[PDB]
Design an enzyme around this catalytic site. Sequence first.
Site, PDB file in Angstrom:
ATOM      1  N   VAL A  62       0.924  -1.130  -0.042  1.00  0.00           N
ATOM      2  CA  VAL A  62      -0.039  -0.118   0.015  1.00  0.00           C
ATOM      3  C   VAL A  62       0.766   1.160   0.017  1.00  0.00           C
ATOM      4  CG1 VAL A  62      -0.243   0.220   2.475  1.00  0.00           C
ATOM      5  CG2 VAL A  62      -2.044   1.298   1.143  1.00  0.00           C
ATOM      6  N   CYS A  63       0.503   2.410  -0.819  1.00  0.00           N
ATOM      7  CA  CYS A  63       1.003   3.543  -0.755  1.00  0.00           C
ATOM      8  C   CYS A  63      -0.159   4.562  -0.615  1.00  0.00           C
ATOM      9  CB  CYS A  63       1.935   3.817  -2.071  1.00  0.00           C
ATOM     10  SG  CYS A  63       1.018   3.804  -3.609  1.00  0.00           S
ATOM     11  N   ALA A  64       0.187   5.841  -1.269  1.00  0.00           N
ATOM     12  CA  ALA A  64      -0.968   7.003  -0.952  1.00  0.00           C
ATOM     13  C   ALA A  64      -1.929   6.518  -2.025  1.00  0.00           C
ATOM     14  CB  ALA A  64      -0.313   8.373  -1.406  1.00  0.00           C
TER      15      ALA A  64
END
Length: 103
Positions: A62-64
């Site tokens: 997961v990232c932004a």
Amino acid sequence: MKSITTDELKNKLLESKPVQIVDVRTDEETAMGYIPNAKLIPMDTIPDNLNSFNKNEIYYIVCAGGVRSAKVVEYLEANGIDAVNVEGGMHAWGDEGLEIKSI
């Protein structure tokens, strides 16, 4: 590329086996809150942290917003690590139920 929605990843919180979530955002970003029990490994440090992954588990990345995370999925699969992109990243996950550390 394997992908999962945030709704489907949340649903895994209802399962007995804990899911391995890796948040690859910068420290500045993660400081504002991250998913409880997520491993915090910013993307630019991922090549120095292959030891955090083992070949037995699936890792949900997961990232932004789901873009950096896709690159990490590619990187990890080129190193024999089973990784799945979290579609929509933290934008989709929302800002509720997140953890911050006081120490």
